[PDB]
Design a protein around this ligand. Structure first.
Ligand code: CL
Ligand code: CL
Ligand code: CL
Ligand code: CL
Ligand code: CL
Ligand code: CL
Ligand code: CL
Ligand code: CL
Ligand code: CL
Ligand code: CL
Lengths: 281, 280
């Protein structure tokens, strides 16, 4: 199996994890539409949708960068319609747009909350809803949402704003899995076990330094790829990247380590940097 | 007893919220109640002003406030007025709610926003604003009217509403952890059956009792039990009837609209009664 001739709609996509997923899918000769709020370069975060588009093309795919605020429902509709008029249908919807603040309810004002809820909970809903009609006909359609398993033990219910937003994304994805089961559209979530170091991290740290406790964005891209090739019956799952990769046949997870043979750190909502019983390097 | 305690409550005009407000008010409590409009609706009974009269008639003091819960500044101003008036907040009840049982295919974004706004964002805003004024107090509780989080496939629909109600609960549960040191309790409370309120009879057009449902007192009384527990009791997703049996109630039929009927179940609940309940 292969994503050749298939079309992806991805929120974000302009850097880091989203870019790596876009690139991986593009490498099979896929189409990728990517939507972001602005096309102006940021002084500290690398990339724009346009430079993302070049990288998608250089990888072997066709790119459609679209300017649109995921918090504006009309802009979302317009971006999907534009994807459909250009590529003819949607095989893959990846909800990657994100927003983060790790403060408590006492520290995170309503305006910051709305940006998180807006982009992630509302955004995942609007993007997914708008994609769904254009996915019904297709060979093996997948919605994939970049969010964590719902962990209900007290330690995990923190910090509240961000947990609400991320769990809200996952709940959207799991609900959709049930509501679209008869239509045959897969909806899954996918989350990495460690922190993922992206170029943006280097830029903000201000150095060319090794993130020894972290993994590369490829861990997410390769895991996504495996999931997007499963049958549309593989649905309603809250998946971890490394676990997905071992189940697929990868034996050596060190190829994802920023620095191999280090003690790895853990992502939020994850107990261990590696799957249970992993013995590889 | 809750004599001399002050409660702030969203969605206390009618039904369950009013029943809770009246039960708290009967101890001589202050109740500040907030709603978007004070204008009577043709079919739904009550306004904040009507509800206010009933709160006073029940034994308490009422402060009815016009405020859109979806407007952050309105929420801030509603809480400020409550504090200028009564001096401090012992109890925050998040009951403002909104419902649509359609799927993601059927519920447009504008509708989604109403549920997200009022319930998830609203519970966040109201709770956030009340919290500083609850830090000094003898036994502060936040009580959020929303269900246990159930992750089995069959509970994960309809998506839009499940997102909202579950988001409500996640907020309550997060607050529990974040405010534990302070220590303001945060719990959720949900009824096992559907609760038949005046609004339901009004929309059917007849006063005809609802054999599969319970009275809103099951909500009010269960709330009263939780709100008198120590602030150490926090982070729980509670069910009315179970709370009531735990407190010593042995006859739940007094909450039945029609005693001796086969009761229906609420969303997110398997059974109309707590496990091994063998009362009437
Ligand atoms: Cl704000
Ligand atoms: Cl824990
Ligand atoms: Cl990167
Ligand atoms: Cl784990
Ligand atoms: Cl192990
Ligand atoms: Cl509607
Ligand atoms: Cl809103
Ligand atoms: Cl099930
Ligand atoms: Cl149950
Ligand atoms: Cl039983």
């Amino acid at each position: 199996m292969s994503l050749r001739g298939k079309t992806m709609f991805i929120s974000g996509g302009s850097r880091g994890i989203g870019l790596a997923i876009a690139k991986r899918v593009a490498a099979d000769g896929a189409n990728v539409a990517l939507v972001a709020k602005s096309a102006e370069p940021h002084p500290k975060l690398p990339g724009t949708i346009y430079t993302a588009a070049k990288e998608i093309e250089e990888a072997g795919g066709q790119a459609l960068p679209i300017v649109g605020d995921i918090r504006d429902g009309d802009a979302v509709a317009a971006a999907v319609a534009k994807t459909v008029e250009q590529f003819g249908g949607i095989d893959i919807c990846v909800n990657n747009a994100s927003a983060i603040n790790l403060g408590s309810i006492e520290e995170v004002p309503l305006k910051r909350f709305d940006l998180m809820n807006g982009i992630q909970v509302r955004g995942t809903y609007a993007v997914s809803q708008s994609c769904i009609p254009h996915m019904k006909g297709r060979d093996n359609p997948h919605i994939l949402t970049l969010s964590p398993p719902i962990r209900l033990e007290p330690k995990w219910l923190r910090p509240t704003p961000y947990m609400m937003a991320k769990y809200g994304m996952t709940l959207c994805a799991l609900g959709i899995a049930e509501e679209l089961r008869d239509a045959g559209i897969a909806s899954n979530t996918l989350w990495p076990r460690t922190t993922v170091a992206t170029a943006a991290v280097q830029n903000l740290l201000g150095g060319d330094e090794a993130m020894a406790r972290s993994r590369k964005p490829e861990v997410y891209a390769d895991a996504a790829y495996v999931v997007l090739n499963k049958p549309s019956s593989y649905t309603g799952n809250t998946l971890l990247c490394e676990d997905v990769l071992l189940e697929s046949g990868v034996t050596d997870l060190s190829v994802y380590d920023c620095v191999p043979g280090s003690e790895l750190g853990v992502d939020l909502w994850v107990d261990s940097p590696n799957p249970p019983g992993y013995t590889g390097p």
